[PDB]
């Protein structure tokens, strides 16, 4: 579902980036969660396929 994934990614973008500067506390958490659920990266960035 790319079209829903895009909205969720937009929300996370607004959550991690503020006033032209990255918020490290949220950025690290988001990166860790995204790697712990690799299916978020989409089929293209999947492990094997």
């Amino acid at each position: 579902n790319p079209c829903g994934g895009e909205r969720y990614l937009d929300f996370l973008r607004f959550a991690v980036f503020v006033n032209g500067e990255s918020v490290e506390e949220n950025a690290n958490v988001v990166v860790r969660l995204l790697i712990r659920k690799p299916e978020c990266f989409g089929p293209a960035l999947r492990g094997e396929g």
Binding site: E6, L9, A27, V30, G42, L45
Partner: protein
């Protein structure tokens, strides 16, 4: 939809990237996060797109 999803994902990751001042300070967490992001997205893919 697919292009927009991947563009949003790359935008989110780039915004999660650590700040230059932190990288210069050499914070271990910042360096680790930058390494993870580099691993996820190769430079050649960005240049090709």
């Amino acid at each position: 939809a697919i292009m927009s999803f991947y563009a949003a994902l790359i935008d989110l990751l780039g915004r999660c990237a650590p700040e230059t001042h932190l990288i210069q300070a050499g914070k271990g967490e910042a360096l680790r996060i930058r390494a993870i992001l580099r691993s996820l997205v190769p430079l050649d893919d960005l240049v090709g797109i």
